[PDB]
Amino acid sequence: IDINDVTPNCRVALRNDSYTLHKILPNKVDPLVSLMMVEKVPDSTYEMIGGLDKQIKEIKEVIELPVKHPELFEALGIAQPKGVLLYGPPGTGKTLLARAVAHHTDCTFIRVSGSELVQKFIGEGARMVRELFVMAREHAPSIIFMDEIDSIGSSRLEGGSGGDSEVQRTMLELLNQLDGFEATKNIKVIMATNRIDILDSALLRPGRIDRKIEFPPPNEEARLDILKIHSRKMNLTRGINLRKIAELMPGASG
Amino acid sequence: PIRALDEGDIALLKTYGQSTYSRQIKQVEDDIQQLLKKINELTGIKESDTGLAPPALWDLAADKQTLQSEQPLQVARCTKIINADSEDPKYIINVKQFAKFVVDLSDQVAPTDIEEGMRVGVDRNKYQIHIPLPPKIDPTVTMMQVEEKPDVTYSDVGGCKEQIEKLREVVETPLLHPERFVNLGIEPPKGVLLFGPPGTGKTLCARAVANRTDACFIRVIGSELVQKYVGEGARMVRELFEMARTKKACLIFFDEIDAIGGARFDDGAGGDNEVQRTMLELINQLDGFDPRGNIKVLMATNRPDTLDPALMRPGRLDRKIEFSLPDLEGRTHIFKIHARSMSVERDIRFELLARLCPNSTGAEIRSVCTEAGMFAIRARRKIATEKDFLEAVNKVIKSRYMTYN
Amino acid sequence: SYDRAITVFSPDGHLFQVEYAQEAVKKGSTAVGVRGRDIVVLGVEKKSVAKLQDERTVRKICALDDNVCMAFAGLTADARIVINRARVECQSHRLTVEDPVTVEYITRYIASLKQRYTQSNGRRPFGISALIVGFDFDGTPRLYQTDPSGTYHAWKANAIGRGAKSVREFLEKNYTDEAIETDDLTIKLVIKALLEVVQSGGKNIELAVMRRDQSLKILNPEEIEKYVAEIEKEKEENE
Amino acid sequence: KGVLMYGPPGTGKTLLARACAAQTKATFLKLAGPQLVQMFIGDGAKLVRDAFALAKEKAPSIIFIDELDAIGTKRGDREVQRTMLELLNQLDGFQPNTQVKVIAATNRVDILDPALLRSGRLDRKIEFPMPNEEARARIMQIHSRKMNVSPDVNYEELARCTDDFNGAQCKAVCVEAGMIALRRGATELTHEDYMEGILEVQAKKKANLQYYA
Amino acid sequence: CGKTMLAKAVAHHTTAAFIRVVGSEFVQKYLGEGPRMVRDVFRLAKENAPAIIFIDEIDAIATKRFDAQTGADREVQRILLELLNQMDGFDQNVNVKVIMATNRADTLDPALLRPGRLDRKIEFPLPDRRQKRLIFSTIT
Amino acid sequence: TKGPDAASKLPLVTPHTQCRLKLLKLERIKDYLLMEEEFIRNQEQMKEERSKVDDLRGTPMSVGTLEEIIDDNHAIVSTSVGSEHYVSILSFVDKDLLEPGCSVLLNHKVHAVIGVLMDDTDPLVTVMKVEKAPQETYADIGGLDNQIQEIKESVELPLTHPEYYEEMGIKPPKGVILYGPPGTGKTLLAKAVANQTSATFLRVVGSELIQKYLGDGPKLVRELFRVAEEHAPSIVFIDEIDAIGTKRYDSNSGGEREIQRTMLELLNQLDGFDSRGDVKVIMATNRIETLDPALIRPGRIDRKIEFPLPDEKTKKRIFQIHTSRMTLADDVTLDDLIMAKDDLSGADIKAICTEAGLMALRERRMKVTNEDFKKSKENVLYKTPEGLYL
Amino acid sequence: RYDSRTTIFSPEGRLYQVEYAMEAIGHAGTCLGILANDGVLLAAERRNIHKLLDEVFFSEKIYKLNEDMACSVAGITSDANVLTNELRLIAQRYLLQYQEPIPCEQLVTALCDIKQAYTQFGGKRPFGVSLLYIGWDKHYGFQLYQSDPSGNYGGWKATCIGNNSAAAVSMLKQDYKEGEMTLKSALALAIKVLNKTMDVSKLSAEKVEIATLTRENGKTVIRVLKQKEVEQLIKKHEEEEAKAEREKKEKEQKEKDK
Numbered sequence A: 001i002d003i004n005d006v007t008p009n010c011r012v013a014l015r016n017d018s019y020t021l022h023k024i025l026p027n028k029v030d031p032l033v034s035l036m037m038v039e040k041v042p043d044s045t046y047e048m049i050g051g052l053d054k055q056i057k058e059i060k061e062v063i064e065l066p067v068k069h070p071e072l073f074e075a076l077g078i079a080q081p082k083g084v085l086l087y088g089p090p091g092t093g094k095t096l097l098a099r100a101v102a103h104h105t106d107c108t109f110i111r112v113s114g115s116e117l118v119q120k121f122i123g124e125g126a127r128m129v130r131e132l133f134v135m136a137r138e139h140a141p142s143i144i145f146m147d148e149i150d151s152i153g154s155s156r157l158e159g160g161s162g163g164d165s166e167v168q169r170t171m172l173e174l175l176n177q178l179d180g181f182e183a184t185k186n187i188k189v190i191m192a193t194n195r196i197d198i199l200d201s202a203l204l205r206p207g208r209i210d211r212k213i214e215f216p217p218p219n220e221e222a223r224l225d226i227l228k229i230h231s232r233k234m235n236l237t238r239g240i241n242l243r244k245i246a247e248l249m250p251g252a253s254g
Numbered sequence B: 001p002i003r004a005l006d007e008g009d010i011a012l013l014k015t016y017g018q019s020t021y022s023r024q025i026k027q028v029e030d031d032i033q034q035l036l037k038k039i040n041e042l043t044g045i046k047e048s049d050t051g052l053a054p055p056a057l058w059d060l061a062a063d064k065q066t067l068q069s070e071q072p073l074q075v076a077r078c079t080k081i082i083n084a085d086s087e088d089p090k091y092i093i094n095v096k097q098f099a100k101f102v103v104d105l106s107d108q109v110a111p112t113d114i115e116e117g118m119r120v121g122v123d124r125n126k127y128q129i130h131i132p133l134p135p136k137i138d139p140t141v142t143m144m145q146v147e148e149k150p151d152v153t154y155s156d157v158g159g160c161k162e163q164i165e166k167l168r169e170v171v172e173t174p175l176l177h178p179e180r181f182v183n184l185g186i187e188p189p190k191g192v193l194l195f196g197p198p199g200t201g202k203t204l205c206a207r208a209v210a211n212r213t214d215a216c217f218i219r220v221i222g223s224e225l226v227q228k229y230v231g232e233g234a235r236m237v238r239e240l241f242e243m244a245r246t247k248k249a250c251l252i253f254f255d256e257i258d259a260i261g262g263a264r265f266d267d268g269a270g271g272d273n274e275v276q277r278t279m280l281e282l283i284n285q286l287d288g289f290d291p292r293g294n295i296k297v298l299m300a301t302n303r304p305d306t307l308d309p310a311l312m313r314p315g316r317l318d319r320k321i322e323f324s325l326p327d328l329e330g331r332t333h334i335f336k337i338h339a340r341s342m343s344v345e346r347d348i349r350f351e352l353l354a355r356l357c358p359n360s361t362g363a364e365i366r367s368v369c370t371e372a373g374m375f376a377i378r379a380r381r382k383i384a385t386e387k388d389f390l391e392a393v394n395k396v397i398k399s400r401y402m403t404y405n
Numbered sequence C: 001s002y003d004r005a006i007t008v009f010s011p012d013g014h015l016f017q018v019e020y021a022q023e024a025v026k027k028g029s030t031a032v033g034v035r036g037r038d039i040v041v042l043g044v045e046k047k048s049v050a051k052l053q054d055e056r057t058v059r060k061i062c063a064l065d066d067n068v069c070m071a072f073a074g075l076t077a078d079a080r081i082v083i084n085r086a087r088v089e090c091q092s093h094r095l096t097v098e099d100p101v102t103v104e105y106i107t108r109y110i111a112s113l114k115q116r117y118t119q120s121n122g123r124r125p126f127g128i129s130a131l132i133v134g135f136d137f138d139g140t141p142r143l144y145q146t147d148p149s150g151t152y153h154a155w156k157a158n159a160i161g162r163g164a165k166s167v168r169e170f171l172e173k174n175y176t177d178e179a180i181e182t183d184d185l186t187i188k189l190v191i192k193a194l195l196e197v198v199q200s201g202g203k204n205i206e207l208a209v210m211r212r213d214q215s216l217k218i219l220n221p222e223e224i225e226k227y228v229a230e231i232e233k234e235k236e237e238n239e
Numbered sequence D: 001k002g003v004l005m006y007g008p009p010g011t012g013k014t015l016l017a018r019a020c021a022a023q024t025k026a027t028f029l030k031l032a033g034p035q036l037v038q039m040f041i042g043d044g045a046k047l048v049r050d051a052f053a054l055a056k057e058k059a060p061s062i063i064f065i066d067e068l069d070a071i072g073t074k075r076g077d078r079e080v081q082r083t084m085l086e087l088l089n090q091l092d093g094f095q096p097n098t099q100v101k102v103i104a105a106t107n108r109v110d111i112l113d114p115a116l117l118r119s120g121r122l123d124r125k126i127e128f129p130m131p132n133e134e135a136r137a138r139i140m141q142i143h144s145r146k147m148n149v150s151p152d153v154n155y156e157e158l159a160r161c162t163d164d165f166n167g168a169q170c171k172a173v174c175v176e177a178g179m180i181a182l183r184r185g186a187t188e189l190t191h192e193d194y195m196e197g198i199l200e201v202q203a204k205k206k207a208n209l210q211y212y213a
Numbered sequence E: 001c002g003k004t005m006l007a008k009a010v011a012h013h014t015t016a017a018f019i020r021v022v023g024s025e026f027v028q029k030y031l032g033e034g035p036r037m038v039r040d041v042f043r044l045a046k047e048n049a050p051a052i053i054f055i056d057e058i059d060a061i062a063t064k065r066f067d068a069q070t071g072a073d074r075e076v077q078r079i080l081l082e083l084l085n086q087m088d089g090f091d092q093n094v095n096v097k098v099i100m101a102t103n104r105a106d107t108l109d110p111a112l113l114r115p116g117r118l119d120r121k122i123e124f125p126l127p128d129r130r131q132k133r134l135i136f137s138t139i140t
Numbered sequence F: 001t002k003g004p005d006a007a008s009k010l011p012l013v014t015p016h017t018q019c020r021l022k023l024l025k026l027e028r029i030k031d032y033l034l035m036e037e038e039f040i041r042n043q044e045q046m047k048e049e050r051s052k053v054d055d056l057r058g059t060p061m062s063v064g065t066l067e068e069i070i071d072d073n074h075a076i077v078s079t080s081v082g083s084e085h086y087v088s089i090l091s092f093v094d095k096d097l098l099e100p101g102c103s104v105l106l107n108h109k110v111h112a113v114i115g116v117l118m119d120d121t122d123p124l125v126t127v128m129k130v131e132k133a134p135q136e137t138y139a140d141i142g143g144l145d146n147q148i149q150e151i152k153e154s155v156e157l158p159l160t161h162p163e164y165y166e167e168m169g170i171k172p173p174k175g176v177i178l179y180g181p182p183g184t185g186k187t188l189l190a191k192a193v194a195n196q197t198s199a200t201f202l203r204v205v206g207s208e209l210i211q212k213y214l215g216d217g218p219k220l221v222r223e224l225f226r227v228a229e230e231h232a233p234s235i236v237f238i239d240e241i242d243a244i245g246t247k248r249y250d251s252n253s254g255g256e257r258e259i260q261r262t263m264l265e266l267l268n269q270l271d272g273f274d275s276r277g278d279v280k281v282i283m284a285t286n287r288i289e290t291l292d293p294a295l296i297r298p299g300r301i302d303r304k305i306e307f308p309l310p311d312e313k314t315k316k317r318i319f320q321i322h323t324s325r326m327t328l329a330d331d332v333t334l335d336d337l338i339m340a341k342d343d344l345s346g347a348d349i350k351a352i353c354t355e356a357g358l359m360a361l362r363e364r365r366m367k368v369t370n371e372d373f374k375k376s377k378e379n380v381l382y383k384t385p386e387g388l389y390l
Numbered sequence G: 001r002y003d004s005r006t007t008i009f010s011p012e013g014r015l016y017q018v019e020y021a022m023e024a025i026g027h028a029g030t031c032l033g034i035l036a037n038d039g040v041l042l043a044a045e046r047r048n049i050h051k052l053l054d055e056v057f058f059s060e061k062i063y064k065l066n067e068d069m070a071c072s073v074a075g076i077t078s079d080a081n082v083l084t085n086e087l088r089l090i091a092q093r094y095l096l097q098y099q100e101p102i103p104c105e106q107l108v109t110a111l112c113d114i115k116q117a118y119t120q121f122g123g124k125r126p127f128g129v130s131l132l133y134i135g136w137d138k139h140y141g142f143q144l145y146q147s148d149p150s151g152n153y154g155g156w157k158a159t160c161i162g163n164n165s166a167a168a169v170s171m172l173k174q175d176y177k178e179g180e181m182t183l184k185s186a187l188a189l190a191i192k193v194l195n196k197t198m199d200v201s202k203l204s205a206e207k208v209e210i211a212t213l214t215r216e217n218g219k220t221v222i223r224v225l226k227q228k229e230v231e232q233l234i235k236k237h238e239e240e241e242a243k244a245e246r247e248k249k250e251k252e253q254k255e256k257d258k
Ligand SMILES: Nc1ncnc2c1ncn2[C@@H]1O[C@H](COP(=O)(O)OP(=O)(O)OP(=O)(O)O)[C@@H](O)[C@H]1O
Pocket: A048, A049, A050, A051, A052, A089, A090, A091, A092, A093, A094, A095, A096, A097, A194, A226, A229, A253, A254, E084, E088, E089, E111, E114, E116, E117
């Protein structure tokens, strides 16, 4: 074994009774984080999404275009977009689009969601975030989905007896990981929220969340599209008018 | 109405708006990065200093020192001599973290100098004693003590006359002139809590005490008393007070004791009862079912309202002293102290500056003097003037009162 | 914690809620006031209005009496209340003594009213500042300024509102006897002062002029445009 | 067999324990709470067992457990709870005929485990109240006995002025009066020195406030 | 009105698995344990293959999300968010069904109440006269 | 006094444009690197008692905590499993250098002191050092002239011209707090300090000094400042310090008390009883009002630097800086975006530039234009009643 | 916390309770008004149109303040009733004093001064009702004003308060002719904006009330349009929309051919 491959904080195997280093093992990863990367991609596809043409184009810009063709951005002289925040009413397809991205991308897809980074022990959510982003950097290019970020990350409260200072610390660590020293190399983040007005201005700041995609409820044309999408596998009788059903459904989500 | 870039779009945008040097620049930058990686790889790794002495100080044949005197004696504490049964002693040992054992001596040329709890040395295979050892010293508590006196005297503490007098009484007069106290039949207070707004001369007075006193002074690191291994903090405070008692006249200086223990209400703090337990042991040591000896305690804290009433009780903290914001005379004195060393004009009105800085602390005034010097520097001037000091006051104290004319 | 009560001193000695009334004044549009030899002038920023909105109901310059005008900066409803009470007191002082109200008297009354509302605890301070410009019965171009705290001063030129500090500094730098030597350079000076804060300069400017014995005259928008053209010409010439 | 002495900090229950150990003969075991939470698993239970065994061997014995709230509050938690259970078992494991009495002490009983205060276990509760006016006058005379206090001091007035001082605070009042008399070169303590003592004990200062006649 | 009893009936005539929990059991003291138990329950169902989770009284946690301003309300909203996540999210479950019982569905969060992959709503009214006849006959 | 660690960084090629001069500069860097690589190769290609001493030294040497050195050849050491042994000291050890608590080295089997290992820095604090140097020079910070001046006077002048202060007996500020709204240059002005400093830079985030166990957060803070003081001059940059340092209220939980204990350890390190070396601290904060006064105290934090939203000239500077490397068209006048009196951070302006570039690329044009910039401004910015005033 | 009382200033100078009332006005039923050189008019939506409700009163939101003035209320019902009675009292007090109808601006100023006093004094919550006044006076002819909970009022050519007021006012801004709008065009625009702002299926005539003020023979007449007239206007608007959709379909067919 060559020393140069033996970097700090790496696992190595030692012979018995001699403690001789004889192999470099996979880098240690917290089991909660390790079982957090996606191994089997969802089966959702961009063809299962209807009425989200512009949202798909913008999200695809932010994620696909930089990783695939950083030369374009270098020629433009601009910095690559880094983060995208999906928001909108309930059920408009915010997680459907994330599943479609995970299925259609060839980048390492990591997924946090809900309060997976909220731990009763002190200073554990921050550590889990650090380990997450270390894992993403290792398996770059990476796309980190974060569903329901308002759970882990929302308007900060004054430090007192009635404030979640620890969840605030977790969010601060996440902010530092998104944009602090040593900017991320190829990690792109897709946060998803159902109410955006409460997220911390630090999270919503550009550079951390470069783009913000709204998901309005379908406008009867997206509703016709969704009806077709979800009735394709169905024995529809003749004379059945999905346009009439779409009209009958005003302000209804996907 | 927004086309998506096709194969031709990307194959032309990378090839149409293009400098004839772009490819070479990119390749050269990549080569530089790779070369940097390779250079770091080859010369990487220094020689971590392992502690080897310069040659010619070593002594080979120490392989014989490793084969003879080989016994890597473990240390054990003889907790019971089994009554010695007259003959056939059959000592008992308490090898910590390992086990208890019933053992005997071996070549112990002084089978009488064994005692109980004498920290004997014991072999590995057969646990016979070989050599006793002096009592444990707990290096953490050993270095907690202050050895080099800080260079702060009772002349850089301006604006604190009554507080300095009280602290001097309680901490020094019982040590250097017991005759007056014994004559008047008064036992002087044993324990002082210095409290005030953040930055008023609390730790500065502690430093002045450390400089003046000729007696043991123990600065207690508030973080060193909190550990894992429940009971460790209580053990450390116990050993600390034991060493203080060993010393003829001791002065402990718990700083920022708000760290070690506030109110004892647990409720959801079931995981923070260890700190409360070490605080309770500190309380017991300060005053309990035992004389405390010539141990005097100092306790500094900004917030003496989170503290436990059992700890604030005036049997443990007997001479609570408040470091209030200095009055005008104190502020003028602080300006004089801090500007003594500065290169300033000879007609600056420090009384005027003290007036301009109300409700300001000594640290605030130090900052004002530093910023005055900084303003002088930011103008290539060697002498800081009254104007610079006024600018510093404006910048530090504050950062319109037309209704208060 | 020493706040939310109008009658509670803070340990530093501050009554914080009247200071908050001043901070509410600071959220109003710039209003400049200048005094000359025979002219007293008030300029104000308009902030423009939605094209569907009417303009005559948006007043910042209100004539309290024949020889007194008041420019406003603060809460609009408080503006209306204080202006109405000031008008009532002008015409009631006329009854009490057969003499027109002096600028000092009327500004003193307005300040006393604001102080009366700051005194108690069941009242909210009048979160407004006012510029009172007028001519005494003898004839003298007086200009006063009243704050929400009930304190009134006499100024030679001052600005209140969003651009208060910048406009006041500019007036300090560029207010002089030669600049107010006649009855037109004062107006030039007021438009110059306002142009430092109002971006447009012609659609965000209203000037009101008071000359001795003459009723308040509000300059036409075309006249404002001509004046700003004159300032622009002088600026380019002297560049 | 079990008496608990509970009260606010400073009322004098530890001093009562010391006085009992003085004028009680017998063998006195001064257990002190946090001493019994050693890190090694089972060491605390071993300590409790050894202490009770020593008390049993020395037949007439009193085990004074200062600040019982340390040994177990209400619920590392496993080990401290096991030590508390060992203490419970040791208490329950002998009839009152045994001459091994136990005197627990506590500032805050609301912390203490209710199971500890049960019939058979520590049962005779002794509330230690804040000293009344006469008690405060007593405490002051007691702690000023060995001084040069002038006969003109009015301990009744001092007790009136205290207003919810502990006995520890009354002692501190006496000590601070002594120090204040040592200042200003005084051969005797005086009532005004005592007043300044109460002031310093409360940490307050006396100033001639300008709006007072 | 026999909704917990219908849950027990499906548990009895269940072929795969039935995990029973009470919504009030998710409000434990230490930070981030209600969500941890929601995740554990759903992971247990997935590992145990086709399963039926039952949550007896969900009103405690799954109420209109509201704007939290303290750690306790925020933690309850966190529990609800974790429940929404696990019931329909990036990790679509296979053969893991859910039943939630409540006294009123009007205070329920619109997201959890989402007439989509999160709930189908049924009412258990007070017994009619005919249903009362049936209840008496069965009980007797 | 190990000395500054610094951060190796290559020269900077002045012409950002793609032209032959840049090629020559880069080629010169590359050719020097190639000569260095070949020199190392030739050194190793042209290249007893200590070997046998190391052979006598244990093969799998263990690390144990020395405790109460005795005699001149026998000391008590710890096995890092709680056990402790009365071991011997070979002549190889330095002696006069062992101190209690020092992580000495022990022979694996016979357990004899054979080394001292005076580099037992925890990995958590070794990772938080700066070995690279971000390429954000002060020329990438549009405006913020006063803030740059303050931080230079605090962490640069005391190292580059340490005569001005000694010439008037003044100690330069040891602590700066950069506070402001979310995104104004607070972290750029630490990146630039790291880039342009010769001192050991130590990145940290307040949410990182908090540790799971009891007494570990304070221990980590003590270790961090110990290493920062061994390496001097050093700068410690605590980003988002309101993670730890928020107001110190009367806690009821245990984790909160431990967090406050970590904060007090930090306070003692910043300005405690004993002393402080040439370690200078830079904290960063979005909301300073919630920080504890003892931390914001002007003995621990001598300077407080506000980073307000940029004014018009600063905004023009930001657009110039962030469109420099962009092939701006001649149809674009970067004044319409400036004039609009809306909250625009430098981060917002950079996002505007990036989105304008993306709009151009979407329109299939590699040169941005004014309509592209307008669209980007409208679509990037995400976030009092009418007539209530005036 | 700076919103526990109406008479408390925020440290920034904002009356949070007054702002709360202003925002709360958004719960009220959408009312709007258009000014035409031929006349002025209000329209308003019936939030609650349950079939079991009776129609005892000819108008729920539109009140007649005096001969030459009407007003639509939007906000709390009790406050609206109080203020309508007070407006009538103010107008009739002016008429008693001067023997001529109160000018519309004067009436608006009086009621808004009452509202300001409520915002300023003691323990009295501000009136949570916005008002739209239409009137005719000898000085400025047909006038339309709007008044807030804070006692601030403005004069408008066209405006909207209540629900979806932002959308309605934007639509009026788009499709209002600053000086060439007659009463017929005003009614058509009102129907259009109400249809596009109510966001409840088709524009049910029973869910809208319209009133028009016009001068006739030298006397002002305020008419609340009958349900027949409202239905006719809605039907004409629906026919116009259908014609526009037919034109768009024909354009789509032509594009398909191309
Ligand atoms: N635009 C759409 N096209 C097709 N199907 C859709 C669309 N939007 C929603 N759906 C359907 O609705 C399901 C739920 O959508 P999704 O999980 O993405 O919603 P969400 O925004 O995450 O909701 P929640 O408020 O529950 O967090 C999707 O799995 C898909 O079945």
